[PDB]
Amino acid sequence: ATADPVKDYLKQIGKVPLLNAEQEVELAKRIEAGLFAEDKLANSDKLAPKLKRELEIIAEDGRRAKNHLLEANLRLVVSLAKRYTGRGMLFLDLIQEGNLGLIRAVEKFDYTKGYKFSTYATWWIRQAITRAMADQARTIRIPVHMVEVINKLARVQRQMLQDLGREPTPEELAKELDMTPEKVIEVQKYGREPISLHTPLGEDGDSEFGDLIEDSEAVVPADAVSFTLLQEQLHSVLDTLSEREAGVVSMRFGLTDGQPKTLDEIGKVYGVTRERIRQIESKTMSKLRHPSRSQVLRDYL
Amino acid sequence: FDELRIGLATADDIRQWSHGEVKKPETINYRTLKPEKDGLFCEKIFGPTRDWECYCGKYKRVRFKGIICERCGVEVTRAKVRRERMGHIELAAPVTHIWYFKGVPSRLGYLLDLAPKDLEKVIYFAAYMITFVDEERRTRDLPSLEAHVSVERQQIEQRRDSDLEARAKKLETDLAELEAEGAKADVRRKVREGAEREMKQLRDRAQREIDRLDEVWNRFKNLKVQDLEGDELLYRELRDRFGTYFDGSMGAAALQKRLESFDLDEEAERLREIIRTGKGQKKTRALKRLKVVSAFLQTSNSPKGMVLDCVPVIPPDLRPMVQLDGGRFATSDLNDLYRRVINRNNRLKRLLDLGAPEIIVNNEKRMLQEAVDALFDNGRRGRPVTGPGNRPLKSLSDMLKGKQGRFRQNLLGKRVDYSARSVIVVGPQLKLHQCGLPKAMALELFKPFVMKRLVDLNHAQNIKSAKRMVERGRTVVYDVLEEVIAEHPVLLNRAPTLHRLGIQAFEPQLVEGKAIQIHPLVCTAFNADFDGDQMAVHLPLSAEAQAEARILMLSSNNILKPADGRPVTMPTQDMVLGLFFLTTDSEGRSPKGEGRAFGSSAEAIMAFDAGDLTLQAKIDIRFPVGTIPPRGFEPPAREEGEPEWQQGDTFTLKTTLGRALFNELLPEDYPFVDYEVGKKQLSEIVNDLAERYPKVIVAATLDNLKAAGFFWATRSGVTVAISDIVVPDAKKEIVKGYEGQDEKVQKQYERGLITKEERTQELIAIWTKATNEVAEAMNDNFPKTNPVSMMVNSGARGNMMQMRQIAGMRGLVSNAKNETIPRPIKASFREGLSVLEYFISTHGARKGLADTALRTADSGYLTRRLVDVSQDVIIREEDCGTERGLKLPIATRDADGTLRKAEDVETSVYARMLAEDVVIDGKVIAPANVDLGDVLIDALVAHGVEEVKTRSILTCESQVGTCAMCYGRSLATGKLVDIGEAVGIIAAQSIGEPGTQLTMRTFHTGGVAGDDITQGLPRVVELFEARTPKGVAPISEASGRVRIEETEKTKKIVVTPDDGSDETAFPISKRARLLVGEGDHVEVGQKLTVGATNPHDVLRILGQRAVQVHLVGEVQKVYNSQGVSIHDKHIEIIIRQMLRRVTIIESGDAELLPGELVERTKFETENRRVVQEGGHPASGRPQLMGITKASLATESWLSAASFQETTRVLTDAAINAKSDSLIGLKENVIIGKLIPAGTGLSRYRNIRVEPTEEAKAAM
Ligand SMILES: [Mg+2]
């Protein structure tokens, strides 16, 4: 009810009864009792209503025992989640994801292996915690196999650093891990953490890092003025040429509309051969290629 | 744009705004850098990231715009739509809003009658809540449940009796068998002790089972709505034992289930009932609860929105993730907070998918609620979500607030295009309206105009070639630039911009160098000093902007400062010294050619160039026809036998050459000024010129004065060698005598006959006497010829204190924490200090620097608060129909046989308007509705009037705003104020301008704290904040008998008013000073203890006029103590905006809440409409409130949102569903519409222009 809900959660765990061996094997037997009983209830066969109510009571007892096992094992998941904390994900979120891993773990347990719950649960705790850390910690999502590759590379790079006391070349790390050096460069480029936009610059407080960046998508008024003047000048030089030449060039690059047209496409509405239409087209390109009608367009690029 | 609404946004509104669900937390792909599908930054929901492209790579063409892609669903459109398109996140379990819950209780509101700690318990998943109870069903079957409980008790008692009988039989059996076996001598005692231990333990668990049954019974017996249960076991056993009777839940869903069935109209009804009858803090509780609940009744917005089910998302541009150099990425913290909320919502959905324990689900819902709270307010509760480990993440609100918020950094003040900045240099060759821009500055500012003119002048074929030449920078570009920038004003501006004259439109002019060349005549109005001060140049752009620059803003139209009407564009540093040397009298300087006639000024100039006549020498110089004689020379005209007039005729004058030159500077129509000019008389001359000549003539005359002042100050004979600074020769013997008597005192103190404190007091007294005496000797020493006196006695630059502590001794100088060293600095700066004397000087110096830094900070703060409180008052009527006014005194402190005018008439009565005609002998001396200048006030005080009735702004009543006539003539134009002039901002700036100029601090407290009232700027801000001053001076409520009651623990005063009035008692401390007579005569006028009176009770017991006079007089007596002159109408505007709120009482027939903040006009309208209905009106008392409280309590919530408390007023507007009319200036600056002041009024924008018929007939 106060601040620091980590303390509130730890007290919300409370004085749960820790389970010595016969207690949790009896609880697991009751789990099986409830689960097989509700499985029998799930069948569509008609039995006595009293037997159905008894099986429902067993199912409720099994659910209660499942709950009790959860509150018994919230201690171990808290003790294990703290091992992987302070790495971009919050401590209580790690606790909750480990709780997901533990409720996945206990569901897949059988009493045939006479082992304690710790050595079987810790595998799923570590697996779910590292999967959640791979999936949700970074702002850009990295798949779990990429995460395990990159942090294996990080740990062997740290081993190299503590071994020879010097920064290794990427070629050495590539050849000692049997991947290509360009792959190593790519994966350590991928393995980066973004910096927040709202970082203060220094003594000044109003000046932030966010106002220093520009945007390439911003429209430049000079560019738009150049574009509309290019359109106007192109229309003017089209009007400068002959009417038929203007008409044939207006369709070859589809200047009038959004679609260009081929020489065979315009040979029906106007009715000339491919030879003549391409000849007059190339004549128009040559005439516009003359240096007289170039300075009006050469600076326009 | 007519109205801007606000309110609670229910989930329907969020879904209407939204375009999809942000189901997944990830933002962008890690290799292709493309936005994800149905996650954050989604192109399907928010829009495409390129222009007319879609996510799946198809549909790249522009022709088929406005269609939906089949593969990926991305609409093809512009990339800017991602600045305006939002989605939403669907939360599995509802969460509360941190703005309403966990805030000021005036906005939490106690809508549900719950303590805030109870809310913390219930909605943060630590204590249960009962949402609904079938009370009538529970009470319907009370005998049945009572019979069941009785049956349970009966069977409990029966099994207890059976167990007791069995235990007794077992105890008897074991005692008998261990007493018959005889295993040990006293084994029966041991087994009996064990049996009785079993007895007591089993009896304990029996009483304990009885106790839990009793406590659950009495807990269920008193269960009702709004009931909490901290213990989870107790709620669980109520659920198990008792079913389908009471409905309860857990978390914010409890608040939603309560609010969906919350009956609030009858709540307001019974709450009004408890308002009607009661006493104590219950009145305040019910008052706040009714002022909050009644908002939901009148307004149509449902109160569902306090607890929310959906969370809208910022569009992705406003929370960007921008690519940088080197592959690094930068994202806003909003994306991280949204990612946290989405992750926790997905995990909660996963837990709800399967069967999960209640503790885990409750913890997940709690962390979801806390993450949503951190999104809305990171750092409101508990430790903020840090992130990287250095700083807290900034939430939505964290950028709607403060200096980094949108209201204060990107809406009121914005960056601008077409602007430039460089250092400033002085140019005497400029006119009054000219400034010199560099070539590069003028090319970059006027670049598009240069390209337009280059294409017009066909130096380049098209626009691109013109830009290429401009970037290359050929000489033809500079030539066409010089052809363009003329007749095109620019706005120059200094960064502090303390008052209205910080922005002045000049005409640019091409100069070399890299500095802006600025007229010296105007640099003092900028506070500009050429020590690397950098001035920004802004370019008016359209026709309207440069027209307002030319007409309203020009530097040749801003002669008079609006603070006091005094001229400010005649500086003093160098030209005043030149004119002083030009016009002073020949004292101490050998006058050559003294007393010889000259035919004209040309002959005098020829003689002065020859060298036989000095510049200042009493000569008879004849003047040509048309020269107006002096004011004092007209009656003593040259004696004439026939009738003649010297008004236009020639004349001879006994004046020097220099005064003839000075009157050649001034225009020919001005009378011959025939005195020492100095500075003050120069200010009077410039004031008269501005009052009696057009603007262009005044600009020309000040330009001539500048040029000649510089010319003669070059040859004035000022310089500072160390021989010019002279120490008094008597200072040696004066200091010798004083140190001799100090030595005598020191050997007197060595015997212990006097204390250290008394010796210190008398020593600082006698050393202050010594420094005053050597200052007088220094004044008696220097001649008029040395340049330091010539530049300090002329009003040029410097004060007598500085010359006192350069030539004479430095005097007494303060220690740390404001005391005085007994040993003063006996060495002058010309002589040079010693080591430790210089150390004690540094003590004062660093404290002074820190003091002026904090002083300018607080002055800026006070200026901003005054601007907010005093804005949105604009001259909006030509004239009122009123005739009421203020009885301002005009003649005061008259001696025997003579009448004298008031000393501060220049700031109080001047530049006002008479309410009515004044008559003394049946004839009007001054007509109504005219300004009061020198001549009219002199005529009135000569005729023998004592007080005048000036039509000021405090008495101004009008339909809207204030009128021009009731305000008085504007002090910045010299004429009547035009309708539309924003007088409020001018008043606020004029009050806030000399805030840095006060430079006051309490020198010494006298060894006691609290005896001295606040001085300087803290006194001003304490006065305008309407706070009670630190030195409280109580005022008697009525005349009567007052005596003292000197109780040992705490002093006491008692006044008993006569005429049967009730006794009132004032508490006074055991402090040193009380000035009232015991058993003496007292009345309402005086104060029981000398000190600052608390103005609240002054208003309460004296009246509105008395408190207005007191406030104006106090702030003016603070301002007059330093030399800064502020006209009293500038204060009167803020005081009128200060007393506008009225506090009402006994409002049982006016059907509104009694005892809150009520506007005066609204209260009067309510009174009119309730006396029209026949009901008796409600009473009301005026409420003197501070500038901040009056600024927050305003009708337009945009202006209050732009001020300090920007979260409380936003929540207040959302709760009250108030929409603000856009009358005002902050709310029109933000939107970008034209402000309704000056040119932006309706009566000015609605003009239609057409040429006359003869005009078009001519051409
Ligand atoms: Mg400076």
Ligand SMILES: [Zn+2]
């Ligand atoms: Zn597509």
Ligand SMILES: [Zn+2]
């Ligand atoms: Zn008026």
